[PDB]
Tab-separated table of C-alpha atoms in Angstrom:
chain	number	residue	atom	x	y	z
A	1	UNK	CA	-23.540	166.557	139.960
A	2	UNK	CA	-22.442	167.302	136.678
A	3	UNK	CA	-20.874	170.764	137.488
A	4	UNK	CA	-17.594	169.058	138.610
A	5	UNK	CA	-16.658	167.320	135.284
A	6	UNK	CA	-17.077	170.839	133.743
A	7	UNK	CA	-14.544	172.350	136.348
A	8	UNK	CA	-16.744	174.289	138.465
A	9	UNK	CA	-14.977	174.228	141.997
A	10	UNK	CA	-17.274	173.572	145.097
A	11	UNK	CA	-16.687	177.012	146.602
A	12	UNK	CA	-18.532	178.357	143.015
A	13	UNK	CA	-21.101	175.698	143.791
A	14	UNK	CA	-22.073	177.297	147.271
A	15	UNK	CA	-22.623	180.807	145.819
A	16	UNK	CA	-24.763	179.744	143.108
A	17	UNK	CA	-27.136	177.473	145.991
A	18	UNK	CA	-26.652	180.646	148.237
A	19	UNK	CA	-28.026	183.160	145.695
A	20	UNK	CA	-30.954	180.441	144.633
A	21	UNK	CA	-31.683	180.084	148.470
A	22	UNK	CA	-31.974	184.170	148.681
A	23	UNK	CA	-33.536	184.154	145.399
A	24	UNK	CA	-36.725	182.099	147.046
A	25	UNK	CA	-36.997	184.301	150.381
A	26	UNK	CA	-39.890	186.582	151.019
A	27	UNK	CA	-39.973	190.218	149.387
A	28	UNK	CA	-40.057	191.534	152.758
A	29	UNK	CA	-36.908	189.500	154.182
A	30	UNK	CA	-34.700	189.380	150.782
A	31	UNK	CA	-33.420	192.542	151.646
A	32	UNK	CA	-31.369	191.485	154.984
A	33	UNK	CA	-30.506	188.222	153.231
A	34	UNK	CA	-29.560	189.526	149.527
A	35	UNK	CA	-26.646	191.748	150.951
A	36	UNK	CA	-24.718	188.626	151.958
A	37	UNK	CA	-24.789	187.546	148.574
A	38	UNK	CA	-24.296	190.735	146.133
A	39	UNK	CA	-20.789	190.364	144.247
A	40	UNK	CA	-18.940	193.973	144.853
A	41	UNK	CA	-15.333	192.749	144.597
A	42	UNK	CA	-12.815	193.026	141.651
A	43	UNK	CA	-9.344	192.605	141.006
A	44	UNK	CA	-7.064	195.199	139.704
A	45	UNK	CA	-3.256	195.585	139.119
A	46	UNK	CA	-2.024	199.451	138.621
A	47	UNK	CA	-1.313	199.972	135.200
A	48	UNK	CA	1.755	201.536	133.928
A	49	UNK	CA	-0.004	204.661	133.275
A	50	UNK	CA	-1.607	204.860	136.533
A	51	UNK	CA	-4.721	203.266	135.899
A	52	UNK	CA	-6.739	200.017	136.805
A	53	UNK	CA	-5.978	196.801	134.972
A	54	UNK	CA	-8.754	194.285	136.232
A	55	UNK	CA	-7.831	190.577	136.271
A	56	UNK	CA	-10.086	188.033	134.511
A	57	UNK	CA	-8.437	185.103	136.042
A	58	UNK	CA	-11.626	184.524	138.411
A	59	UNK	CA	-15.287	185.138	137.403
A	60	UNK	CA	-17.069	187.480	139.718
A	61	UNK	CA	-20.975	186.798	138.465
A	62	UNK	CA	-22.650	183.683	138.766
A	63	UNK	CA	-23.863	183.818	135.507
A	64	UNK	CA	-20.513	183.921	134.223
A	65	UNK	CA	-19.253	180.905	136.219
B	1	UNK	CA	8.814	189.741	165.394
B	2	UNK	CA	6.531	186.643	166.097
B	3	UNK	CA	2.699	187.319	165.318
B	4	UNK	CA	-0.309	185.688	167.205
B	5	UNK	CA	-1.963	183.155	165.123
B	6	UNK	CA	-6.034	184.265	164.341
B	7	UNK	CA	-7.452	181.533	166.975
B	8	UNK	CA	-5.897	182.397	169.657
B	9	UNK	CA	-7.935	184.883	170.290
B	10	UNK	CA	-11.090	182.226	170.348
B	11	UNK	CA	-11.332	180.927	173.588
B	12	UNK	CA	-14.484	178.179	172.838
B	13	UNK	CA	-12.233	175.469	171.641
B	14	UNK	CA	-13.140	171.517	170.953
B	15	UNK	CA	-13.182	169.305	173.226
B	16	UNK	CA	-11.984	165.788	172.224
B	17	UNK	CA	-12.835	162.421	173.922
B	18	UNK	CA	-9.685	160.178	174.950
B	19	UNK	CA	-9.945	156.846	173.082
B	20	UNK	CA	-8.769	155.436	176.468
B	21	UNK	CA	-11.214	156.740	178.598
B	22	UNK	CA	-15.055	155.634	180.070
B	23	UNK	CA	-18.258	156.149	178.222
B	24	UNK	CA	-20.926	158.815	179.687
B	25	UNK	CA	-24.463	158.523	179.249
B	26	UNK	CA	-25.649	161.799	177.351
B	27	UNK	CA	-29.251	163.553	177.137
B	28	UNK	CA	-28.464	166.307	175.507
B	29	UNK	CA	-26.658	167.193	172.178
B	30	UNK	CA	-24.903	170.643	172.096
B	31	UNK	CA	-25.480	172.407	168.737
B	32	UNK	CA	-23.818	175.168	167.565
B	33	UNK	CA	-25.775	176.429	164.265
B	34	UNK	CA	-23.612	178.665	162.374
B	35	UNK	CA	-23.982	181.308	159.122
B	36	UNK	CA	-21.131	183.168	157.812
B	37	UNK	CA	-19.217	183.546	160.704
B	38	UNK	CA	-22.453	183.723	163.029
B	39	UNK	CA	-24.068	181.547	164.883
B	40	UNK	CA	-27.867	181.133	164.931
B	41	UNK	CA	-27.520	178.810	168.087
B	42	UNK	CA	-24.744	178.721	170.567
B	43	UNK	CA	-23.777	174.978	172.478
B	44	UNK	CA	-27.816	174.749	172.997
B	45	UNK	CA	-28.527	171.449	174.272
B	46	UNK	CA	-31.174	170.146	172.370
B	47	UNK	CA	-32.928	166.481	172.223
B	48	UNK	CA	-32.098	165.543	168.545
B	49	UNK	CA	-31.033	167.475	164.866
B	50	UNK	CA	-31.534	166.201	161.633
B	51	UNK	CA	-29.635	167.089	158.857
B	52	UNK	CA	-29.406	166.011	155.159
B	53	UNK	CA	-26.010	165.238	153.929
B	54	UNK	CA	-24.871	164.191	150.259
B	55	UNK	CA	-25.376	160.126	150.996
B	56	UNK	CA	-28.331	160.753	152.584
B	57	UNK	CA	-30.328	161.818	155.868
B	58	UNK	CA	-28.597	161.403	159.259
B	59	UNK	CA	-30.481	161.734	162.798
B	60	UNK	CA	-28.030	163.089	165.296
B	61	UNK	CA	-28.617	162.362	168.760
B	62	UNK	CA	-25.970	162.599	171.803
B	63	UNK	CA	-22.960	160.409	171.917
B	64	UNK	CA	-23.194	160.063	167.906
B	65	UNK	CA	-19.966	158.496	166.838
B	66	UNK	CA	-17.022	161.077	165.124
B	67	UNK	CA	-18.192	161.974	161.796
B	68	UNK	CA	-18.263	164.619	159.236
B	69	UNK	CA	-20.962	165.232	157.148
B	70	UNK	CA	-20.916	167.284	153.635
B	71	UNK	CA	-24.337	168.615	153.516
B	72	UNK	CA	-26.502	169.715	150.589
B	73	UNK	CA	-29.137	172.194	149.850
B	74	UNK	CA	-31.863	170.876	152.166
B	75	UNK	CA	-34.318	171.531	155.399
B	76	UNK	CA	-32.665	170.915	158.623
B	77	UNK	CA	-34.332	169.887	161.892
B	78	UNK	CA	-33.839	170.666	165.596
B	79	UNK	CA	-35.987	169.162	168.398
B	80	UNK	CA	-35.663	170.428	171.996
B	81	UNK	CA	-36.136	168.102	174.893
B	82	UNK	CA	-39.176	170.176	175.801
B	83	UNK	CA	-40.757	169.037	172.751
B	84	UNK	CA	-40.318	171.925	170.364
B	85	UNK	CA	-39.287	171.616	166.701
B	86	UNK	CA	-37.000	174.528	164.856
B	87	UNK	CA	-36.927	173.852	161.057
B	88	UNK	CA	-33.896	176.000	159.260
B	89	UNK	CA	-32.870	175.801	155.533
B	90	UNK	CA	-29.273	175.440	154.431
B	91	UNK	CA	-27.607	175.715	150.977
B	92	UNK	CA	-24.732	173.790	151.944
B	93	UNK	CA	-21.538	173.816	154.055
B	94	UNK	CA	-20.403	170.809	156.761
B	95	UNK	CA	-21.467	169.283	159.771
B	96	UNK	CA	-18.839	168.072	162.483
B	97	UNK	CA	-20.093	165.525	165.057
B	98	UNK	CA	-18.141	164.849	167.802
B	99	UNK	CA	-18.529	161.781	170.185
B	100	UNK	CA	-17.989	163.987	173.245
B	101	UNK	CA	-21.624	165.224	172.550
B	102	UNK	CA	-21.060	168.272	170.369
B	103	UNK	CA	-22.174	168.940	166.699
B	104	UNK	CA	-21.168	172.140	165.208
B	105	UNK	CA	-23.318	172.896	161.964
B	106	UNK	CA	-21.365	175.583	159.422
B	107	UNK	CA	-23.431	176.408	156.724
B	108	UNK	CA	-22.979	179.315	154.097
B	109	UNK	CA	-26.769	180.038	154.680
B	110	UNK	CA	-28.987	178.843	156.990
B	111	UNK	CA	-32.580	180.543	157.200
B	112	UNK	CA	-35.755	179.588	158.797
B	113	UNK	CA	-37.911	177.701	156.650
B	114	UNK	CA	-40.623	180.383	157.426
B	115	UNK	CA	-38.913	183.168	155.859
B	116	UNK	CA	-38.676	181.275	152.460
B	117	UNK	CA	-41.935	181.990	150.092
B	118	UNK	CA	-43.239	178.833	147.861
B	119	UNK	CA	-44.697	181.071	145.607
B	120	UNK	CA	-41.606	183.059	144.961
B	121	UNK	CA	-40.078	179.492	145.016
B	122	UNK	CA	-42.809	177.807	142.511
B	123	UNK	CA	-42.169	180.775	139.578
B	124	UNK	CA	-38.458	180.874	140.025
B	125	UNK	CA	-38.350	176.982	138.971
B	126	UNK	CA	-40.258	177.789	135.968
B	127	UNK	CA	-38.378	180.904	135.036
B	128	UNK	CA	-34.922	178.592	135.412
B	129	UNK	CA	-36.470	175.663	133.392
B	130	UNK	CA	-36.953	178.290	130.540
B	131	UNK	CA	-33.352	179.459	131.345
B	132	UNK	CA	-32.253	176.022	131.215
B	133	UNK	CA	-33.794	175.552	127.528
B	134	UNK	CA	-32.156	178.622	126.276
B	135	UNK	CA	-28.853	177.750	128.018
B	136	UNK	CA	-25.851	178.314	125.392
B	137	UNK	CA	-23.338	175.567	126.678
B	138	UNK	CA	-23.071	172.617	128.939
B	139	UNK	CA	-22.048	174.677	131.915
B	140	UNK	CA	-24.267	177.377	131.607
B	141	UNK	CA	-26.918	174.170	131.952
B	142	UNK	CA	-25.045	172.616	134.868
B	143	UNK	CA	-25.328	176.166	136.690
B	144	UNK	CA	-29.051	176.237	135.874
B	145	UNK	CA	-29.534	172.885	137.118
B	146	UNK	CA	-28.080	173.952	140.524
B	147	UNK	CA	-30.477	176.608	141.014
B	148	UNK	CA	-33.299	173.843	139.840
B	149	UNK	CA	-32.189	171.395	142.430
B	150	UNK	CA	-32.434	174.162	145.131
B	151	UNK	CA	-35.458	175.804	144.220
B	152	UNK	CA	-36.996	172.020	143.688
B	153	UNK	CA	-35.901	170.952	147.378
B	154	UNK	CA	-37.181	174.180	148.934
B	155	UNK	CA	-40.319	173.669	147.157
B	156	UNK	CA	-40.686	169.992	148.416
B	157	UNK	CA	-39.501	171.208	151.525
B	158	UNK	CA	-42.443	173.715	152.152
B	159	UNK	CA	-45.004	171.160	150.612
B	160	UNK	CA	-44.184	168.483	153.228
B	161	UNK	CA	-45.171	171.030	156.123
C	1	UNK	CA	-16.667	120.085	156.174
C	2	UNK	CA	-17.596	122.069	159.733
C	3	UNK	CA	-13.939	123.422	159.703
C	4	UNK	CA	-14.824	125.475	156.436
C	5	UNK	CA	-17.026	127.545	158.551
C	6	UNK	CA	-14.305	127.724	160.886
C	7	UNK	CA	-11.472	129.015	158.910
C	8	UNK	CA	-13.341	131.623	156.856
C	9	UNK	CA	-14.991	132.957	160.199
C	10	UNK	CA	-11.296	133.421	161.369
C	11	UNK	CA	-10.449	135.226	158.051
C	12	UNK	CA	-13.288	137.118	158.751
C	13	UNK	CA	-12.351	138.269	162.342
C	14	UNK	CA	-8.900	139.304	161.388
C	15	UNK	CA	-10.127	140.835	157.871
C	16	UNK	CA	-11.990	143.284	160.003
C	17	UNK	CA	-9.202	143.836	162.502
C	18	UNK	CA	-6.946	145.377	159.786
C	19	UNK	CA	-9.548	147.698	159.064
C	20	UNK	CA	-10.076	148.716	162.672
C	21	UNK	CA	-6.532	148.848	163.158
C	22	UNK	CA	-6.607	151.369	160.200
C	23	UNK	CA	-9.067	153.609	161.249
C	24	UNK	CA	-8.102	153.797	164.814
C	25	UNK	CA	-4.237	152.972	165.014
C	26	UNK	CA	-3.634	153.850	168.839
C	27	UNK	CA	-6.305	151.266	169.387
C	28	UNK	CA	-4.097	148.269	168.271
C	29	UNK	CA	-3.610	146.530	171.473
C	30	UNK	CA	-7.272	145.879	172.604
C	31	UNK	CA	-8.390	144.858	168.947
C	32	UNK	CA	-5.648	142.466	168.771
C	33	UNK	CA	-6.731	140.989	172.277
C	34	UNK	CA	-10.258	140.734	171.258
C	35	UNK	CA	-9.585	139.229	167.867
C	36	UNK	CA	-7.766	136.329	169.790
C	37	UNK	CA	-10.252	135.861	171.830
C	38	UNK	CA	-12.920	135.199	168.784
C	39	UNK	CA	-10.194	132.738	167.132
C	40	UNK	CA	-9.917	130.783	170.470
C	41	UNK	CA	-14.005	130.724	170.974
C	42	UNK	CA	-14.149	129.722	166.984
C	43	UNK	CA	-11.271	126.945	167.316
C	44	UNK	CA	-13.186	125.738	170.219
C	45	UNK	CA	-15.862	124.662	167.597
C	46	UNK	CA	-13.451	123.257	165.163
C	47	UNK	CA	-11.953	121.074	168.086
C	48	UNK	CA	-15.505	119.581	168.688
C	49	UNK	CA	-15.741	118.658	165.206
C	50	UNK	CA	-12.360	117.518	165.025
C	51	UNK	CA	-13.049	115.244	167.953
C	52	UNK	CA	-16.267	113.935	166.329
C	53	UNK	CA	-13.915	113.051	163.344
C	54	UNK	CA	-11.352	111.270	165.595
C	55	UNK	CA	-14.089	109.156	167.573
C	56	UNK	CA	-15.739	107.885	164.098
C	57	UNK	CA	-12.335	107.704	162.442
C	58	UNK	CA	-10.333	105.346	165.126
C	59	UNK	CA	-13.551	103.698	166.422
D	1	UNK	CA	2.393	177.775	146.737
D	2	UNK	CA	4.074	176.290	150.060
D	3	UNK	CA	1.566	178.674	152.207
D	4	UNK	CA	-1.054	181.380	152.043
D	5	UNK	CA	-0.732	183.622	154.658
D	6	UNK	CA	-3.728	185.960	155.539
D	7	UNK	CA	-2.530	189.281	157.973
D	8	UNK	CA	-5.610	191.088	159.293
D	9	UNK	CA	-6.474	192.776	162.424
D	10	UNK	CA	-8.393	191.546	165.273
D	11	UNK	CA	-10.431	193.913	167.553
D	12	UNK	CA	-10.124	192.697	170.990
D	13	UNK	CA	-12.005	195.527	172.424
D	14	UNK	CA	-13.122	199.341	171.818
D	15	UNK	CA	-9.468	200.346	172.194
D	16	UNK	CA	-7.617	197.251	171.345
D	17	UNK	CA	-6.372	196.170	167.816
D	18	UNK	CA	-4.164	193.533	167.400
D	19	UNK	CA	-2.231	191.898	164.355
D	20	UNK	CA	-3.451	188.342	163.700
D	21	UNK	CA	-2.123	185.956	161.353
D	22	UNK	CA	-3.955	182.783	159.517
D	23	UNK	CA	-1.371	180.553	157.693
D	24	UNK	CA	-3.045	177.795	155.405
D	25	UNK	CA	-0.706	175.111	154.383
D	26	UNK	CA	-1.389	173.890	150.625
D	27	UNK	CA	-3.391	170.852	150.159
D	28	UNK	CA	0.039	168.488	149.766
D	29	UNK	CA	1.654	169.432	153.030
D	30	UNK	CA	-1.822	169.323	154.672
D	31	UNK	CA	-2.683	166.095	153.951
D	32	UNK	CA	0.760	164.970	154.499
D	33	UNK	CA	0.739	166.616	158.244
D	34	UNK	CA	-3.023	165.355	157.900
D	35	UNK	CA	-1.686	161.638	157.415
D	36	UNK	CA	0.592	161.637	160.429
D	37	UNK	CA	-1.751	162.931	162.953
D	38	UNK	CA	-3.998	160.218	162.312
D	39	UNK	CA	-1.078	157.500	162.258
D	40	UNK	CA	0.920	158.602	165.689
D	41	UNK	CA	-0.283	159.908	168.809
D	42	UNK	CA	1.578	163.194	167.999
D	43	UNK	CA	-0.892	165.576	167.357
D	44	UNK	CA	-2.899	164.379	169.906
D	45	UNK	CA	-6.041	166.280	169.655
D	46	UNK	CA	-6.387	166.205	165.908
D	47	UNK	CA	-6.163	162.094	165.901
D	48	UNK	CA	-9.841	161.479	166.055
D	49	UNK	CA	-10.300	164.411	163.455
D	50	UNK	CA	-7.429	163.286	161.255
D	51	UNK	CA	-9.087	159.899	161.137
C-alpha cells in the first residue's frame, strides 16, 4: 500500500509478511516454520589486511528495512 | 564448453493449449500448491480453488481462462470433488491459471489455517499497534502496518471459521 | 434517427475488435470475420429504417 | 547489467552431481522478448503467457 512510495521493494514486503505469519503460528509448530524466516546471511568483501568488510548495501533484518 | 540450463533437469513442464483447437469439458482442476520450492499438493485433481488476489477474490474452476494473479496475505480454499474443504493461509506470491485446466499457486509461505493460533495473533496485533505508535519514521510505520494487515487478516480468517 | 443507434453500434464492434486483436494477435482472422458479420447484421436494420424513410419521402 | 547468471550444482542422484545454469536477463531485455512473443507466432509456447 504505502510502502511502495517509500522505495521498499516487493521482495522485502514478502519477507515481512512471512515473518509475521510465522509469528502467529502456534508455539508448538513455530519451530518448524521459523527456521524458514531467520536471517543468517551477510555480504562480505575480503579486506586489504585479510579481514571481512561487511557491505551495507542491502539490509538483512526486517526491523532495519 | 556449454552448460545445461537448470530447467533441463525438470521433467514436469507446463502444457499450453493451442488457440486453434477444440474445447474440452473438464470436471477437475489440477492444482499445484507450492511453498519455498516445496509442493504441498502436486497435480491434485480438485473441484475448485478460491484465492484472494489484489483486486479481489477469485473462484477458479476447471476451464478457467488464462490469468496471472498477484496474491495478498490471505486464506486459500481448496474444495475437492468428494466434498472436502482444505484451508491454507498464504503470506504472498503468485497464482498462474491455465486454460488447459491447471493452476500453479506458488507462495512464499503456505500454512494450514489450523496451525495458526488466534490468541498469539490477537496479542501480536496489540503489540504491533503499540509499535506503530512508537514508530520512528514513515518507513518504520509502513513496515509495521504491513505486519498489522497480515495479523488482522489472520485474525479475521480464523474468526470466520 | 434510427441510424444513430446503428452507426454507433458498428463503432462498438470495431472498438472491441481492436482490443481483442491486441490481447490475441494470432487470432486476427476469426475476429475480423465476426466483426464483418456483426456489421452486416446491424446494416440490415439500417436498411430497414432507410426503406421506411424512402417510402415516406417518395410516397 | 545485461544478464545475471547463477552457476550451481544439480543433484541428479546420490552419485551424479552436474553443473547447472540459470540465466536471468535484466528487465529491459526480458520485457522486449516478452513483447515479441506476444506479438508473433515465434515463441509459441510463450504466446499465451506473454499476453
